[PDB]
Every structure is written in C-alpha cells, then in structure tokens.
C-alpha cells in the first residue's frame, strides 16, 4: 500500500505543536528570579 | 457472462443467473411433522400450509458442507427447469467457500460440481474476495476492506488487501445469527412459553424487534422498569399458522400491559432480550464464548504489519452479512471500532445497502468483468491436471 | 386433604453432597456445545474433517482469537439481567432472592448427570 | 486524559503511556520526572487518569 497525504500533514502539524510547546514550557519554567537564591542564603547563613 | 452465481452458505442461497436474479434459497431441506412425509427442499418450504415444528436438514455444521445429499437435492431442484431451468452445458458457475473450507469438502465438491454437472468455469472463490471486488469496484481509491461477515454462524474480520484476502489477520471470531437464534429460543421459552422448537418463527422475533442497544446498560436499566416507558414494547403477537402465517409486532397503542389479551392470540413475547441477542453479538463473554465482538477483531487485523496500511483499513470498513442487518449494528460497531483505532488513523465504517446480496451482486460483476474468462478453470482442464488446477487458481 | 407431596418426597436433601470444580466446568461445557448444537433439542463428520485440519500454519484451528481484554460481565441466567450474586453450589450467576429460589428449584444440582 | 492503556518507561529516558477516550486512542511520550507521579498515584492500565501538560 501506501501512505495517506492527510495523515503525514498531521503529524507535521502536531510535531510543530508539540516543538512549539516545548518552547512555551522551557520559557515559562525559568522566567521568574529568586527573591534571594540559594548562594545568598549560604553565605548569610552562619553555622 | 451468463453464470450460477452460487452463495451455498448454510441458512442462504443467493444463487442467479447473472441477469438480477438475487434469490436466497434454504441450503437445507425441511421435514415438517404437520406434512406427514415430505423433505421439502429448498423453496418448497412456501408449499408447506404450517411450518410449525419443521425438523431442519442442514447440509452444514459450523458451515462445512456434509451430508452432501441435501445441498445436492437443492442445488438439482435449483437448477432443475422449474427454478433455474436445464441449463449447464455451457452455463459456467461461480461459487462461494468458507474461509478455510476443510480442503476434501469442496475439493470433493468440485469434483461433483465438473463432472456430474459438467458445463464451463466454477471460479470457486470465497465469498469475502466476491465482496471485496464489488466494494473495489463502487471504491477505486480505497484499498483494503474487511468483508466483516456478520452471517449465518459465522462472522470474520479479513485484510483484503487489492483482492488479497491477508490469510493471516483473518479473525473468524464465531457466534453468528444462528447462535444468537438459538440463544434466543432458550431463553424466550424458559422465560416463557416453552415453544422452543418452531425455530423460524422465533426467527421472525430475533429479526423482527432485536436491535443494538446503544447503551447496553442504560437500555437495560430502561427494559427492566416497572410500568409502561422502560422502552420494552414488544408483545410480538406469534402466528400459530391456524390464525395468521408470519408473527408481527402489536403496535404500542395496542398493547395491553397487563399480559392479559382476550383475542386468543399467542400473545408472550416480553422484550428486552431484544437488545441482549445483538448485544452477545458484539459483547462477548456473556453467552460464555471466550473471542472478542466484531470490533475488537476488527482492530486486531488493523494491527496486522503494514503499518501504512491500518490506515485504509479501517477507513474501507465493510459490515457484511446477514447480522449485521441488527439495528445499530453500524453505529455501534463504529463506535467501538473509533474508540479503539489511533486518533489520527482516521476509522470509516460503512454497511453494504443489503449485506446479505452483496456478495452475489459482485460475483455477478466479476462474471461481467474480464481476467475471469481469463484465470478461471473447469472441467475442460480439469480434464488434465485433477484438481491442481483448481487449487492452484483457488 | 393431604400436602401430597411426602409420598414422593424427590429431593429430600438431608444427604445432598454438592456438586462442584470441574463439574462447574462440564455444566458451562454442556452449555457451550448446547448453544453450539442443533436442530434436535453432521457433527461427527464436521469433527473429523476438523481433525483432519489439525496444522500449526494459518487455517480453522490457528484462526481463534483467544481471552478478551474486556472482562467477563456478570449476567442473570434467569431474567439475563446483570447479577451481583453467584450461586455457591454450582457457580452460576443471579441477581435476586427469587431468582435464587427457581434456579435451587430447577437448574442447581439438577442437571450435572 | 484517559483510559491508560499502556505505561512503558524506556535512567530512566522517557515514559510512553497510551491513552483511550470515546475519539480514539492516542501514544503519549511523558517526561521521566512525571514517571514519579504515576507510581506514587499507583496508575496501571485501565485507570482513568488526567496528566496535565504544563
């Protein structure tokens, strides 16, 4: 047989949904700063 | 040309001339207790005044001719001159087989069929090939349907791939309308009315109010509910052959919830098992029998190995058969077949307009159709190489 | 007058000794071939060209599906509607108390002969 | 959301865990940190589950 012109244009369509989601994620999960982060509390801290 | 279109399936005979002949015959012969001595065969069972508890002689058992007697008898009487008259000399015929016929059946079959009837090709091909060239046909683009045989005592799930019917992912399940007939015998007399011996007029209720809930348990919840609404409705008004010749459905309006009519009528019949026969038929393991409904088997083939292909599998569904006449049987098996094909691979459940003709409006076409003459086989090389040549062409 | 029933007395169950296991079986057995059975409530001959069939490459016998994936539902027997119980004895399946009383009185034990 | 259908962790790289609505069946690729959540909500095939994307 063969293979379907609709159903390899959906996967491309969904492959770009998927890569363009990976870009939404990776951009959301580090857009915010800590309010001090973790070396300022280390060298505050005191033993 | 001119061919003997055979569909010498166990409850159907869709024998024609290939000129619009689509006539279904018993494949079997009937004693009938109220006829004294007569085995009436094949349409004469329309001679008979009451077919009451008619004793039937089936020629095949899970659909494997045997016996050969009543299938020789009817296949005379059809050809005969009153029904398809003396005609053979040159008039070929082409005949169905079962999947996975047992080989010396219809090899021994094929030998009586040349040389004790004697007249050009047989062409013996499965009725799911006939069916897919005539889908083919009606669908030149599409590739590969399932001639999903919802018949008799049978029902497959096929990869017709081009007319090549995938002898691999061939799924035969079982539990066809026989079976479910029977089924309902039992369970209608042990309910009520032990009447469990009349067969065809039970029949006439299994294809008169049976259907395929769409909402098996919903359905049920409804049928099973006091007073009037709870769908039920059925009261299927039996014909004792003295008073009427074929049993109907009493209209709604008519129904007397009580049970109680005062016309004399054999008046039971009490519904629900309508949905429940056609339900054993999809899902299975109620009746007891372990194989999946129609449209598990219908998946598992999809799945096969031509991943490319599945596609187009389930896009080129072909419900065929006799069951799937059942109401809802489309829908349904759709339904369940989508659940369970891939998002993306797109499913395409179509029914044949009669699915029990189906085949024999193929057969008729191919006979048409060239590389018929061509390909082929009869007696003429027959008369050579046995029957090599046969299975070598089938 | 009289109950009319001592003088027969059929069941009298003071030694009944159940019937179970692999009885269960042959009984869903019977029933199997019966629902696969016939006009009378040829064979023999379907049997033995099957036997004649018997191969490991693709035909009658290769050709089964096998267990499904959905389980077994439960369903009633005597009504066939859909049943929380199970009769202890033989197995089979109901949903009410009365339905348990006509299946005691015509098909539990009484059929496994 | 769906029907799960399967789970097949591939140190762990990834997650494949196959879905099942009344629409079809879709194969899902799930990041391995997600693999934590599965077993800790003991997920096994044919629970009803909603893994949310984000």
């Given at each position: ?47 | ?174 539990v066809?309308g026989?079976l479910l007939t029977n089924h309902l015998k039992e369970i209608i007399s042990y309910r009520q009315l032990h009447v469990m011996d009349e067969t065809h007029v039970i029949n006439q209720v299994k294809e008169d109010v049976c259907y395929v809930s769409q909402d098996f348990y919903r359905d049920m919840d409804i049928a099973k509910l006091k007073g009037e609404e709870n769908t039920v409705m059925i009261d299927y008004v039996l014909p004792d052959f003295?008073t009427i010749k074929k049993g109907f459905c009493k209209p709604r309006e008519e129904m007397v919830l009580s049970g109680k009519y005062k016309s004399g009528e054999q008046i039971l019949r009490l519904a629900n098992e309508r949905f429940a026969v056609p339900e054993i038929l999809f899902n299975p393991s109620d009746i007891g029998?372990?194989?999946?409904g ?29 069951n799937?006449l059942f109401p809802g049987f489309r829908d349904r098996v759709y339904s369940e077949?989508?659940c ?55 | ?30 029933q199997?071939?019966?629902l ?34 959905r389980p077994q539902r439960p369903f009633c027997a005597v009504c066939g509607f859909p049943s929380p119980y199970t009769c202890?004895?033989?197995?089979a399946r109901y949903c009410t108390v009365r339905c348990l009383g006509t299946h005691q009185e015509t098909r539990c ?5 | ?21 009344a ?32």
């Amino acid at each position: 047989p063969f293979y379907l012109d609709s159903l390899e244009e959906k996967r491309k369509r969904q492959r770009s949904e998927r890569l363009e989601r990976i870009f939404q994620l990776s951009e959301a999960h580090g857009a915010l700063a800590p309010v001090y982060g973790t070396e300022v509390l280390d060298f505050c801290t005191l033993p | 040309m001119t061919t003997l279109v055979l569909d010498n399936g166990a409850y159907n005979a869709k024998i024609g001339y290939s000129h619009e002949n689509v006539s279904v015959i018993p494949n079997c012969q009937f004693r009938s207790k109220t006829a004294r001595l007569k085995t009436f065969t094949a349409n004469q069972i329309d001679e008979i005044k009451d077919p009451s508890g008619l004793f039937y002689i089936l020629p095949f058992q899970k659909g494997y001719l045997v016996n050969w007697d009543v299938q020789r008898q009817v296949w005379d009487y059809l050809f005969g001159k009153e029904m398809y008259q003396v005609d053979f000399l040159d008039t070929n015929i082409i005949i169905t087989e079962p999947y996975f016929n047992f080989t010396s059946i219809q090899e021994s079959m094929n030998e009586i069929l040349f040389e004790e009837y004697q007249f050009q090709a047989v062409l013996r091909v499965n009725a799911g090939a006939l069916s897919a060239h005539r889908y083919f046909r009606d669908n030149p683009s599409e590739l590969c349907c399932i001639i999903v045989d919802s018949g008799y005592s049978f029902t497959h799930i096929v990869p017709y791939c081009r007319s090549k019917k995938k002898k691999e992912a061939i799924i035969r399940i079982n539990v066809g309308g026989k079976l479910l007939t029977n089924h309902l015998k039992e369970i209608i007399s042990y309910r009520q009315l032990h009447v469990m011996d009349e067969t065809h007029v039970i029949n006439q209720v299994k294809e008169d109010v049976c259907y395929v809930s769409q909402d098996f348990y919903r359905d049920m919840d409804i049928a099973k509910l006091k007073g009037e609404e709870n769908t039920v409705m059925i009261d299927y008004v039996l014909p004792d052959f003295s008073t009427i010749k074929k049993g109907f459905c009493k209209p709604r309006e008519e129904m007397v919830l009580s049970g109680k009519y005062k016309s004399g009528e054999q008046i039971l019949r009490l519904a629900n098992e309508r949905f429940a026969v056609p339900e054993i038929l999809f899902n299975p393991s109620d009746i007891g029998i372990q194989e999946m409904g129609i449209p598990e088997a219908i998946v598992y083939s999809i799945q096969n190995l031509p991943e490319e292909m599945q596609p187009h599998f389930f896009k080129n569904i072909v419900l065929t058969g006799g069951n799937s006449l059942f109401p809802g049987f489309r829908d349904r098996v759709y339904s369940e077949v989508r659940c369970l094909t891939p998002t993306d691979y797109d499913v395409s459940v179509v029914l044949p307009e009669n699915p029990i003709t189906y085949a024999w409006e193929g057969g008729k076409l191919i006979s048409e159709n060239d590389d018929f003459e061509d390909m082929v086989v009869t007696r003429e090389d027959y008369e050579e190489n046995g029957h090599s040549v046969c299975e070598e062409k089938f | 007058m009289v109950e009319k029933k001592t003088s027969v007395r059929s069941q009298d169950p003071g030694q009944r000794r159940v019937l179970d296991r692999a009885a269960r079986q042959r009984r869903i057995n019977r029933q199997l071939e019966a629902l696969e059975n016939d006009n009378f409530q040829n064979f023999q001959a379907l049997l033995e060209e099957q036997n004649l069939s018997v191969a490991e490459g693709p035909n009658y016998l290769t050709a089964c599906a096998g267990p499904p994936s959905r389980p077994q539902r439960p369903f009633c027997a005597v009504c066939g509607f859909p049943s929380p119980y199970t009769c202890v004895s033989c197995g089979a399946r109901y949903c009410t108390v009365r339905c348990l009383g006509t299946h005691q009185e015509t098909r539990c034990l009484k059929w496994t002969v | 959301e769906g029907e799960v259908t399967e789970l097949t962790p591939c140190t762990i790289s990834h997650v494949i865990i196959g879905l099942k609505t009344a629409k079809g069946t879709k194969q899902l690729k799930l990041d391995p940190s997600i693999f934590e959540s599965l077993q800790k909500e003991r997920v096994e095939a044919g629970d009803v589950i909603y893994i949310e994307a984000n």
